[PDB]
Design a protein around this ligand. Structure first.
Ligand SMILES: CCCCCCCCCCCCCCCCCC(=O)OC[C@H](COP(=O)([O-])OCC(O)COP(=O)([O-])OC[C@@H](COC(=O)CCCCCCCCCCCCCCCCC)OC(=O)CCCCCCCCCCCCCCCCC)OC(=O)CCCCCCCCCCCCCCCCC
Ligand SMILES: CCCCCCCCCCCCCCCCCC(=O)OC[C@H](COP(=O)([O-])OCC(O)COP(=O)([O-])OC[C@@H](COC(=O)CCCCCCCCCCCCCCCCC)OC(=O)CCCCCCCCCCCCCCCCC)OC(=O)CCCCCCCCCCCCCCCCC
Ligand code: 07D
Ligand SMILES: CCc1c(C)c2cc3nc(cc4[nH]c(c(CCC(=O)OC/C=C(\C)CC/C=C(\C)CC/C=C(\C)CCC=C(C)C)c4C)c4c5nc(cc1[nH]2)C(C)=C5C(=O)[C@@H]4C(=O)OC)C(C)=C3C(C)=O
Ligand SMILES: CCCCCC/C=C\CCCCCCCCCC(=O)O[C@H](COC(=O)CCCCCCCCCCCCCCC)COP(=O)(O)OC[C@@H](O)CO
Ligand SMILES: CCCCCCCCCCCCCCCC(=O)OC[C@H](COP(=O)(O)OCCN)OC(=O)CCCCCCCCCCCCCCC
Ligand SMILES: COC(C)(C)C\C=C/C(C)=C/C=C/C(C)=C/C=C/C(C)=C/C=C\C=C(C)\C=C\C=C(C)\C=C\C=C(C)\C=C\CC(C)(C)OC
Ligand SMILES: CCCCCCCCCCCCO[C@@H]1O[C@H](CO)[C@@H](O[C@H]2O[C@H](CO)[C@@H](O)[C@H](O)[C@H]2O)[C@H](O)[C@H]1O
Ligand SMILES: CCCCCCCCCCCCO[C@@H]1O[C@H](CO)[C@@H](O[C@H]2O[C@H](CO)[C@@H](O)[C@H](O)[C@H]2O)[C@H](O)[C@H]1O
Ligand SMILES: CCCCCCCCCCCCO[C@@H]1O[C@H](CO)[C@@H](O[C@H]2O[C@H](CO)[C@@H](O)[C@H](O)[C@H]2O)[C@H](O)[C@H]1O
Ligand SMILES: CCCCCCCCCCCCO[C@@H]1O[C@H](CO)[C@@H](O[C@H]2O[C@H](CO)[C@@H](O)[C@H](O)[C@H]2O)[C@H](O)[C@H]1O
Ligand SMILES: [Fe+3]
Lengths: 256, 45, 275, 304, 47, 47, 47, 45, 44, 47, 45, 47, 45, 44, 47
């Protein structure tokens, strides 16, 4: 009557169907944006570019958008830079859906939860073109705020209670003011130094004494933590490697 | 899996197919004797 | 069928139950024991919903409804024709949700990430359980749960809301609405800030965390931080769900009257009760 | 077992901010630090930028708020006690039907119209402020358009639908309980606003926004041990945190987003929540008198 | 026709086809059950 | 047909098939209980 | 038109056609089922 | 896939699909005998 | 690729002709049962 | 006029055009189905 | 793409759109014969 | 006026122009359908 | 982009748009023959 | 070990038979109490 | 079935069967309690 267009069809229904068309287009756009990393898909066994995909393939992958960096650098998304098919693991079954048996110590072989993305060897930059993740020694201005336990010199122990080492230095992000890493000197090897992510620590400020505990890896696992080069500025690949190694603890912290 | 153990498993699998189907067929025969489930043109009863 | 980086984390282990029996993938999906159980419950619940649609008079997707048993049955199991099907679908839905969350737990262990996602899904499962189990049990009948239907569960929402004659006056409902709206606003702000930092315009090199902090320091006067924003957003959504659960437990099990005139307590505090 | 839900150890440094052109106005606010905010997020407070558009928006908004509050206090005969008693029930009511879109008497809705105009102007000037602040920092204007969606819903509620109906009588009052009562009576007058399909879409997108911002928050908190909270850096250089975040959802859900595109989903769900809502508000009364009868006609109701 | 298996893996084809056929059979059976004439359980007279 | 176990591992396909069979059987029993003639617990008269 | 397969991979065209025609067949069948005349399950009278 | 198994798989697939089609055809014939599903120009008298 | 383009097009044409032929036979049978083009006075 | 294909990938153009044409055709068919006169399935009389 | 393949694609596209437009116009003519969609001063009937 | 394409990308401008014209045409058509006089599906009388 | 095709586009564009208008105006003329959209002093008809 | 599989199968089949025997006895007791197969006219 | 436990974990199998059997028995017991005839707590009359 008042709002109809043709007998049964009215304005509200037409606007609804217009929204449905727009939402289908928006879903297509959002899925195109989603398919900007890890695409196109590879075969599970051989690794050839194959996938059960229809007429939407032409619309599935977007043209590489270009990200500009404040160093002259550039990222392409999608960049069709893929991983090698042969990893340090073997198929439990040759059925393309089976999982992988690691063929070694997966902590130091970067297999599974220990696997780290193959990033670039450049530290995160600040607004001034300098490394963002730095030790507190080479950032005199930065200081640990009061009313919080200072995690310097506290014993670093695992869940079993064994004192893995001692913390000497804190590594912090300059871009976002927060602690990133604790520098830990090994009680077993003074000549060895490791980085333990701050996200992997408990404050433990409420106990008989003050200590730093880690629930992921055991004390001996601190003897194989990946090392870094500059000791005062850490690249993205190095930090990603260290975090992946520490995060691999929970799955297989007691052998494989 | 090998080509021989597959046959060995297929033998016992077929035996279980037959046992399951026979039990189910007896169940359906008993239910049909109790209450058939195909209506007539005039319905049921 | 794998991402460019997928055939590197597809290791075994990380499963709570099943060992190596169901530790595999089908297409993109990880199955596990709890994927099998969520298929078990989903297939059965959906088949029962379609069966109730067949018993129904419509087949109109928005008029298909599975009604809970009449309140005259109390908390008793009901005959499948009249009420029992809703109960079985409820139990199957609970089992499927729990299997989904547990499969998420196995995936989290396999990838060595935190269990935040299944914990957050636990709150949605709890909201559903409070709507179909906890509240009907406290109220004493399964007929206080909502029907499983597209538009009929909205009829349930409206009927129960107007049962207390204005359900807006439920203060826990006010707080849950505030949290839901604030979650939507915070999500808009966060997605917008991330997109604007990543896509700053022609030229316009990608901006860092300092630029993102500066934007909301200039516009609002405070910036939460690229890590704290996900914290506050998860807490906002979970608290919205918690306060919705509270407002629905308060209505019926605890309060059985008009929410609008619950607020007369405020009108009659001793320092303005002019009488 | 740490979760990155609270920051046990905080860091405090010399406050700093991205460089902007000086302009007519400087940065204002002498930045300080707070402890609970630093526990949940960053600790620094301010400084707030106050440009020409900022001053304009603040003046218009303050004028509107003072008008609204003065009217609310005057409605209870300037009694602070009785203002406390009735504060929630107090409301600046819109002008009646007979006055159309013209100026009503101040007591009969003129103050409501003046306050609404000043509030609309301040909100639009705040939108311009968000746009200009994003452009000044050499960033994109996604926040401005996300805000424009909310402004569309606000103007549809307050101004656009009155324009279409030629009448401010059915606009929403300036009160705590009065605007909820407006919501209730608007739904009742137009037949079970659940049967509005754009209301259903808006609720779907609000639920989806909460769902998405719980999923995404929990995902980033789950990969925060892997540098996953540093989202823009994982967008420009994909780390293993982003890879595991994608693979979790790909294995549990069949598909996944990018660290960049998940926030596109986040943007669009929030924007659509209010876009569909504004459309549904603009459609009621003008095109659809009774949403229940529309639902009956179109198969949403069993046709009593 | 046998060249179709040079396009499609047989294992995933079998599992997907089985799933699709089962869902279709469930749908048709339920549709018949909702039908007055073809509900073999309710069994109303066709006259 | 003995070759099907090359396409599907018996140790897991068997358990998945058992679960599917249980779901189907329980669904059919629920459907029968929902009826008026084949509900053996209600035992409503056919006449 | 034998050249279109230089543009469209046979797998992609075949999967897309399968899905699209299945959905279209469902849609047309459901439209027929919602009609008074062509609903072959209730079999309502023509006149 | 290796073509050395496509010959076997297609023949098994053809045999099984003809078996499935024949069983379905016999079931449809039985249902039609019990109750046809194509009304005449009066309904279902 | 043109290596199997001709033969795939031939098999595709055979399949699509089979599909259209059976669909046309189905439509013919449906039309014999009940035509779907109403006359000037509607359906009778 | 043959130059438009230098602007657009022929696959993109063809798939987008097929999508747009099918959606438009569906739209027009549904609009006709909504009318009393052009609905060929209920077939209301011209008179 | 190169200009030769663009010209060939244009030729095939022109032939295809000609066939599509001809078949659509044929369908429109049959629909017009069935029921014209342009009403007169009094309407349709 | 041929220098406009030195400012606007012909591909982007042509796509935007096509989409804008399609939406405008669709809106005008629906507006005419809404009116009594120019609705060509009901075909109401001029008088 | 280089000017070498700035005219090459334009010559097509300024033609195609013309053709578009040449069709659209034609359509409008037919509509005016059917039902004019400019009412007179006493309204339509 | 492999012998452990045989021992588990022996104890498991012993448990199978005892569990199914007690279940059958319970079902027989219930059937004597109240049979669950209604007649043509129902139970009553 | 000689050694089927060389393939299935006896602990996992035992726990899964205990849970399945408990759930099924609870379901059957609740279904009986839903009835009018086999509710041994309500204790209705057979006659
Ligand atoms: C309505 C109001 C508003 C409400 C707001 C919300 C509205 C809802 C819409 C928005 C929310 C959902 C958004 C997602 C939509 C798109 C989802 C999607 O594209 O997922 C593709 C996803 C696969 O991702 P992909 O990269 O496109 O893989 C396709 C490859 O070409 C090949 O993949 P493959 O060969 O690896 O796949 C093999 C797989 C078979 O894969 C499938 O079954 C999926 C087929 C389609 C892909 O194996 C089996 O499962 C058997 O599969 C799914 O759809 C999973 C189901 C999710 C929906 C339920
Ligand atoms: C197929 C059939 C269905 C169609 C489905 C279309 C799906 C939507 C596609 C989409 O979302 O693209 C987002 C895309 C995201 O841009 P981006 O990659 O973040 O920009 C990177 C630049 O470096 C940085 O760019 P920027 O920040 O300088 O760009 C600002 C730009 C817009 O860019 C943004 O700020 C983010 C996107 C805002 C919404 C834009 C999409 C609107 C809906 C689709 C059209 O401002 C505008 O052009 C105005 C857009 C909003 C106007 C809303 C007025 C009301 C319209 C409805 C009534 O934004 C646009 O496509 C803008 C479209 C402009 C024409 C709008 C016509 C209305
Ligand atoms: C009895 C009541 C009835 C009942 C049936 C029912 C029930 C439910 N509903 Mg609803 N609702 C009813 C009525 C109804 N409902 C809505 C709206 C929604 C949307 C709002 C989205 C939002 O974010 O809004 C909120 C966003 C706005 C208003 C837009 C942005 C606002 C801005 C920028 C304001 C800026 C402010 C300042 C700068 C501050 C200074 C100013 C001053 C001091 C004055 C959302 C989706 C939503 C949710 C649900 C749910 C979940 C339920 C359940 C569970 O039952 N409802 C609005 C709308 O969009 O409708 C299409 C709307 O207008 C309207 C009406 C009349
Ligand atoms: C996607 C849809 C989503 C939905 C669910 C959603 C809902 C609601 N969003 C709501 C409120 C606001 N939203 C905002 C801002 C505007 C501020 C303004 O207008 O100031 C302009 C007004 C005024 C100036 C008037 C008063 C002023 C006061 C109280 C101070 C008076 C005193 C003074 C000046 C003196 C003292 C101080 C000195 C310095 C001297 C406010 C806080 C904004 C945004 N929403 C977005 C989106 C969403 N909003 C996005 C993307 C945003 C922005 O960009 C923008 C912003 O700044 O966000 C931080 C409300 C009430 C909502 C509900 C639920 O109803
Ligand atoms: C999921 C959350 C959905 C929230 C909004 C739902 C709005 C639906 C309201 C509605 O019902 O809108 C109607 C249907 O829209 C339609 O299906 C359009 C198709 C709906 C697609 C839904 C996609 C979800 C993803 C209007 O169209 P009609 O021509 O009258 O259809 C009539 C028949 O369908 C039923 O007799
Ligand atoms: C900014 C401050 C000014 C805002 C108002 C602007 C004019 C609005 C129309 C005035 C009018 O004439 O609208 C009056 C009529 C109702 O008239 P009535 O029949 O009730 O008359 C009774 C006696 N007066 O609205 C309509 O029916 C038409 C509505 C058209 C669309 C309304 C939404 C417009 C939103 C603003 C868009 C601005 C874009 C500007 C270009 C970039
Ligand atoms: C700083 O304050 C001190 C004094 C402490 C206290 C002051 C004030 C107080 C206590 C204020 C309290 C205010 C309250 C409780 C406000 C509640 C507000 C709510 C909930 C509002 C909610 C919705 C209202 C909306 C959405 C109204 C929208 C109206 C609009 C958009 C109207 C626009 C109207 C226009 C543009 C009119 C045009 C017509 C004319 C011709 C007049 O325009 C010139
Ligand atoms: C595990 C798989 C098991 C597969 C089981 C498949 C069973 C299918 C049964 C098909 C044959 C049934 O055929 C059906 O038989 C019943 C017999 O009661 C007939 O029923 C007829 O006879 C009965 C008994 O005298 C009377 O109610 C009446 O005369 C009439 O209804 C139906 O007219 C006929 O259509
Ligand atoms: C008339 C009815 C009531 C409506 C109010 C109308 C007046 C207020 C809105 C006018 C339009 C404002 O539009 C905006 O104006 C301000 C100046 O005021 C300008 O912005 C200016 O202030 C900004 C503040 O960040 C500074 O960077 C700088 O001093 C200058 O750019 C913008 O370039 C212009 O986009
Ligand atoms: C997987 C197997 C799928 C099998 C699908 C089979 C599809 C075809 C089945 C129906 C074939 C047509 O079947 C035929 O239909 C015509 C209607 O024109 C009917 O015609 C017959 O019955 C009607 C009344 O019911 C009488 O008016 C008519 O005089 C008589 O000849 C019959 O029902 C049958 O002779
Ligand atoms: C290219 C695509 C866009 C095309 C745009 C075309 C726009 C111009 C179309 C209309 C032009 C004006 O058209 C002119 O209107 C006047 C209005 O009085 C008409 O005048 C006459 O027509 C009306 C129509 O009811 C009569 O009642 C009356 O006798 C008289 O007023 C002229 O007969 C007509 O020629
Ligand atoms: Fe984020």
């Amino acid at each position: 009557n008042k709002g109809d267009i043709t007998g049964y069809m009215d304005v509200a229904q037409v606007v609804l169907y217009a929204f449905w068309i727009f939402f289908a287009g928006l879903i297509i756009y959002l899925r195109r944006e989603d398919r900007r990393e890890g695409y196109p898909l590879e075969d599970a066994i051989s690794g050839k570019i194959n996938s059960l995909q229809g007429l939407g393939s032409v619309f599935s992958i977007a043209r590489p958008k270009i990200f500009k960096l404040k160093t002259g650098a550039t990222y392409a998304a999608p960049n069709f830079k893929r991983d090698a098919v042969a990893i340090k693991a073997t198929r439990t079954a040759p059925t393309a859906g089976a999982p992988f048996e690691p063929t070694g110590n997966p902590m130091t072989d970067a297999v599974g939860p220990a696997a780290y993305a193959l990033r670039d060897e450049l530290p995160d930059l600040t607004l001034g073109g300098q490394p963002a993740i730095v030790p507190l020694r080479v950032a005199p201005t930065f200081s640990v705020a009061a009313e919080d336990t200072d995690p310097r010199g506290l014993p670093v122990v695992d869940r079993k209670g064994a004192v893995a080492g001692k913390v000497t230095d804190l590594w912090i992000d300059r871009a976002s003011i927060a602690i990133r890493y604790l520098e830990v000197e090994l009680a077993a090897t003074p000549g060895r130094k490791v980085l333990l992510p701050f996200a992997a620590t408990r404050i433990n400020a409420k106990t008989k004494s003050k200590t730093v505990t880690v629930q992921s890896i055991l004390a001996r696992h601190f003897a194989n933590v990946p090392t870094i080069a500059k000791t005062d500025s850490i690249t993205r690949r190095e930090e990603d490697k260290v975090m992946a190694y520490y995060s691999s603890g929970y799955l297989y912290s007691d052998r494989v | 899996i090998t080509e021989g153990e597959a046959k060995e498993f297929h033998k016992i699998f077929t035996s279980s197919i037959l046992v399951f189907f026979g039990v189910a067929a007896f169940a359906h025969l008993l239910v049909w004797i109790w209450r058939p489930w195909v209506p007539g043109p005039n319905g049921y009863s | 069928a794998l991402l460019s980086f997928e055939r590197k984390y597809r290791v075994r282990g990380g499963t709570l139950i099943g060992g190596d029996l169901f530790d595999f993938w089908v297409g993109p999906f990880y199955v596990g024991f709890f994927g099998v159980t969520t298929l078990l419950f989903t297939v059965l619940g959906t088949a029962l919903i379609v069966w109730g649609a067949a018993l129904g008079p419509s087949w109109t997707f928005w008029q298909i409804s599975i009604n809970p048993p009449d309140v005259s049955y109390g908390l008793a199991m009901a005959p499948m024709a009249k009420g029992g099907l809703w109960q079985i679908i409820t139990f199957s839905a609970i089992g499927a949700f729990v299997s989904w969350a547990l499969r998420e737990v196995e995936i989290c262990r396999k990838l060595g990430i935190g269990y935040h996602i299944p914990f957050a899904f636990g709150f949605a499962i709890l909201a559903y359980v409070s709507l179909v189990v906890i509240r009907p049990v406290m109220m004493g009948a399964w007929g206080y749960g909502f029907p499983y239907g597209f538009m009929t569960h909205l009829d349930w929402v409206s009927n129960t809301g107007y049962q207390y004659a204005n359900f807006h006056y439920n203060p826990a409902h006010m707080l849950g609405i505030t949290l839901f709206f604030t979650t939507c606003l915070a999500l808009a702000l966060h997605g917008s800030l991330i997109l604007s930092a990543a896509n700053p315009g022609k030229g316009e090199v990608v901006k860092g965390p300092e630029h993102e902090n500066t934007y909301f320091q200039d516009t609002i006067g405070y910036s939460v931080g690229t890590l704290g924003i996900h914290r506050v957003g998860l807490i906002l959504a979970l608290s919205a769900v918690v306060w919705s659960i509270i407002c629905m437990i308060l209505s019926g099990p605890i309060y059985t009257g008009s929410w609008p005139d619950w607020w007369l307590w405020w009108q009659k505090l001793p320092f303005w009760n002019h009488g | 077992e740490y979760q990155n839900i609270l920051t046990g150890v905080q860091v405090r440094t010399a406050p700093h901010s991205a460089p902007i052109a000086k302009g007519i106005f400087p940065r204002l606010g002498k930045p300080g630090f707070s402890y609970w905010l630093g526990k949940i997020g960053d600790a620094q407070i301010g400084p707030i930028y106050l440009g020409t558009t900022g001053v304009l928006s603040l003046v218009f908004g303050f004028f509107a708020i003072e008008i609204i509050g003065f009217n609310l206090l005057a409605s209870v005969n300037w009694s602070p006690m009785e203002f406390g008693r009735q504060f929630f029930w107090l409301g600046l009511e819109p002008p009646a039907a007979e006055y159309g879109l013209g100026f009503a008497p101040l007591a009969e809705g003129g103050w409501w119209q003046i306050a609404g105009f000043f509030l609309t102007t301040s909100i639009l000037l705040w939108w311009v402020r968000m746009y200009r602040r994003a452009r000044a920092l050499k960033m994109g204007t996604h926040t401005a358009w996300a805000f424009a969606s909310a402004i569309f819903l606000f103007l549809s509620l307050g101004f656009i639908r009155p324009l279409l109906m030629g009448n401010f009588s059915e606009s929403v009052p300036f009160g705590i309980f009065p605007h909820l009562e407006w919501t209730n009576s608007f739904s009742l007058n137009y037949g079970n606003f659940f049967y509005n399909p754009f209301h259903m879409l808006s609720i779907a997108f609000l639920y989806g926004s909460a769902l998405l911002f719980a999923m995404h928050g929990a995902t980033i908190l789950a990969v925060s041990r892997l540098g996953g909270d540093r989202e823009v850096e994982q967008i420009t250089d994909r780390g293993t945190a982003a890879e595991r975040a994608a693979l979790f959802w790909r294995w549990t859900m069949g598909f996944n987003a990018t660290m960049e595109s998940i926030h596109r989903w986040a943007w669009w769900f929030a924007v659509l929540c209010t876009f569909t809502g504004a459309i549904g508000i603009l459609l009621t009364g003008t095109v659809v008198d009774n949403w229940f009868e529309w639902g009956v006609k179109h198969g949403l109701a069993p046709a009593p | 026709m046998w060249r179709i298996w040079q396009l499609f893996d047989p294992r995933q084809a079998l599992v997907g086809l089985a799933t699709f056929l089962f869902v279709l059979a469930l749908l048709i059976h339920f549709i018949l059950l909702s039908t007055e004439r073809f509900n073999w359980l309710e069994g109303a007279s066709t006259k």
